Amino acid sequence: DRGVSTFSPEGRLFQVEYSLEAIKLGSTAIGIATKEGVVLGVEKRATSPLLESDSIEKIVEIDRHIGCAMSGLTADARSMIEHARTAAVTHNLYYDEDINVESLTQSVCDLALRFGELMSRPFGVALLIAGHDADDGYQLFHAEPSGTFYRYNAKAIGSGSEGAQAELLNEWHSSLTLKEAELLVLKILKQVMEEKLDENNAQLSCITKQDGFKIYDNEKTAELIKELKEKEAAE
């Protein structure tokens, strides 16, 4: 066989590059950042109709001011979330304050490359970390298993990511409202999803300064889906 922490001739880590292929197989997750808040949406993708879709937890709270969406081998994200939550709460204990979204992301990404022959392989999951702090305001980060994180205005990850990212390229502007962003996530999710989009197989969430991180109810999302269809038929 071959070493886990080996470089390819091109200058990349084999295992990190292979973990990126696993993330492409994962269900779609989209995040959009605005001045009124950050919206996170995910494709649930139930493998069978007997599976209770509400138990599919691909959007997750880290702290009151930070949220997280995932895509890929979602079981690998559990320890990443556990670490993030501990980092967030620990920082509050030491410094009597909320922790910066970037610092939280950096803390998560430090785990990423702590593998070799520490854990046995990289994580097979990408994370969209969304949050708000007093310094840099509303933020959206994309945390990879390479240990790298980019900040984004909008970002899609998963199977329909390249198609959805191209769509986010055209649609995003700096003056987007929260309501406009919500519909935009739902619009782009419906385009790249295999099955037909509804409140059961797709989930929305957001983070605002005032009310903090909130996962939307299926009743609330259903109205936004109905609002979306009417607006597209209107022209």
Binding site: L93, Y94, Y95, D96, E97, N100, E102, S103, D135, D136
Partner: peptide, 22 residues
């Protein structure tokens, strides 16, 4: 190290107090 780890954020007096407790 607060500056290094938190993008040169200013350490508030209340945050310093809690840090000194620890």
């Amino acid at each position: 190290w607060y500056h290094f780890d938190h993008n040169d954020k200013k350490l508030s007096i209340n945050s310093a107090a809690r840090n000194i407790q620890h």
